[PDB]
Design a protein around this ligand. Structure first.
Ligand code: LBV
Ligand code: LBV
Ligand code: CL
Ligand code: CL
Lengths: 321, 321
């Protein structure tokens, strides 16, 4: 009912005995601490000073080639001797939780592993994703058509078409929030034949207050496969704190099951969105759908994040005119 | 004497019998058509429809492994069968002259060749640069400190420090133009011990009107080695037009000898700048120096171009506040 209102406090998650989430209580789902990840990658956590590996996703062996039990308790100084110093330097204590370190690692299988790391408090969160063998050059050519737009609607149209051209997604929308937190599709690029959502409005409840809050802090999130089961972290609690591990800054964070059902009800196989944040407030989303499961590659997600940040400034300039 | 005044018409270049350039006539130097390039890369031009190679820099054999005479008149369809279709698709007739196609080619020597192409009228201009084996990820982490700046001066300071950290340049300045076209160093990041230019002002003549005009169209230029002799194009005129080839959109464009002397007088071995363009007007430059010759890698130059575009929007937002 309002973009400026605080979200409600969260319930405990399910693995700490919290309540099942229904349409009556879903604003209280603790979406940032699901204790699990999407299965197209693996996640480890590690102490930010010692590098000791503290938690691992149960599927870690598939991606890393070693079982969860042997890797646990080993240090990153030993495991990643080539990356550990760089990672430390990049993510010092107290850095922003949205700051990332990225590297590409070689692995027995085809392509590489992409490694993305961020810091929350005293914890480092490491995401591993298979990638095949996008420059900053993409973003460069894409800024030109955005800078040439004559007004806010024209900017919206070209930004959505640009994102579609870059990603190949079946649908790319610009969804703009109103002050009552309802939202509206103001531009859409879509594959020929797909039903249009352009000009449609949706209730505030479709993107609940705690999601909107999270999306003001961590600007990109996705569901690669709307039918894929989440993979638990083990142990599920961070041993540093004996409390849940915040996963808001990890793209591999498991998506709310309530939203997964919403996406399936729409016939969506894969979803991704990027926040448009203007003057520190959530202005809208670049919201993308695919008809089938799709893993957008790491570097492309970063181009889209940067683009999201470009678009926010372009909007802020134009709204001031 | 004014940022809004038109530049004077240019003299013919030296190779068409134009006058020698002195401090009395230097606003008329045709800097965009020097008929030559910097020697750290090679350049070819080609017909935009047929792909026939029309001009080549005299050093082309060093980079391409084949002498200028045999490659001339061959088509890109034959020479670059893997890139020619993509290049065509990327740079259609009538596209912006600042739009670029980039690819990496393998060559007998160490590393690769970077290929950058743009279109001017019916001509494609191909630049080849050796590069060793930067993600969009650089630009991403760099936007954070810029978005956090509390005012225009703070933004200037962090942007210059960011560019220095990304590039390793000995000096990075933000130079801001006044309405009379004089300019002023408003932020500076520099190696310990180097003499400060912070807060210094310079006459309009140091960046003459035709340079300022060019820099409003083509947002990055450089001199990799301030003592290096230029390499002619052959033939020097575009056969399509029997007229000079515009090189404003090619980083390999030879720098004005007058500016090269200026840089040497400052003890500068390498220079690079990026335009900051606000509301279509040249607001300032991110101006970089190195004490010794330096070739900033292609992808890093693009990150800096994008950053330049980021900074311009951030300035435009703040000036509106
Ligand atoms: C064409 C119109 C259109 C709309 C309006 C739309 C909405 C949308 N919801 C999103 C997220 C969430 N929604 C809910 C919860 C509820 N949603 C409901 O309807 C009720 C039943 C409910 C609870 C009672 C939760 C917990 C999240 C957080 C998920 C997470 O990050 O873990 C996102 C962002 C993520 C993404 O891009 O995929 C989008 C873009 N997507 C469209 O295509
Ligand atoms: C610390 C202060 C400081 C200043 C003020 C500064 C100036 C500067 N001049 C630039 C360019 C040019 N200047 C001139 C000509 C003349 N210059 C003069 O003084 C008189 C003698 C003269 C003619 C009579 C021409 C033709 C060009 C175009 C070159 C080209 O693109 O081919 C550039 C951009 C290029 C770059 O980043 O390296 C910069 C940043 N660079 C600094 O570091
Ligand atoms: Cl979080
Ligand atoms: Cl030109």
């Amino acid at each position: 009912g309002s973009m400026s209102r605080d979200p409600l406090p969260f319930f405990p998650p399910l693995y700490l005995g919290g309540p099942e989430i229904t349409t009556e209580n879903c604003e209280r789902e603790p979406i940032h601490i699901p204790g699990s990840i999407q299965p197209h990658g693996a996640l480890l956590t590690a102490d930010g000073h010692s590098g000791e590996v503290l938690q691992m996703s149960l599927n870690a062996a598939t991606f890393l080639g070693q079982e969860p039990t042997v890797l646990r308790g080993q240090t990153l100084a030993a495991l990643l001797p080539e990356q550990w110093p760089a990672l430390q330097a990049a993510l010092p204590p107290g850095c922003p939780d949205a700051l990332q370190y990225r590297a590409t690692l070689d692995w027995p299988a085809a392509g590489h592993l992409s490694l993305t790391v961020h810091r929350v408090g005293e914890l480092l969160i490491l995401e591993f994703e298979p990638t095949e063998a996008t420059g900053p050059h993409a973003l460069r050519n894409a800024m030109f058509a955005l800078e040439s737009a004559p007004n806010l609607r024209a900017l919206a149209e070209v930004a959505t078409q640009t994102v579609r051209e870059l990603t190949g997604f079946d649908r790319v929308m610009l969804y703009k929030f109103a002050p009552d937190a309802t939202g509206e599709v103001i531009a859409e690029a879509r594959r020929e034949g797909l039903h249009a959502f352009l000009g449609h409005r949706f209730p505030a409840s479709d993107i609940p207050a705690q999601a909107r809050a999270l999306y003001t802090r961590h600007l990109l999130r996705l569901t690669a496969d709307t039918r894929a089961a989440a993979v638990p972290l083990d142990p599920v609690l961070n041993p540093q704190t004996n409390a849940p591990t915040p996963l808001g800054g990890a793209v591999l964070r498991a998506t709310s099951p309530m939203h997964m059902q919403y996406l399936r009800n729409m016939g969506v196989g894969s979803s991704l969105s990027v926040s448009v944040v203007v003057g520190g407030q959530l202005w809208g989303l670049i919201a993308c759908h695919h008809q089938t499961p799709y893993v957008l590659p790491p570097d492309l997600r970063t181009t889209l994040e940067s683009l999201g940040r470009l678009l926010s400034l372009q909007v802020q300039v134009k709204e001031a005119h």
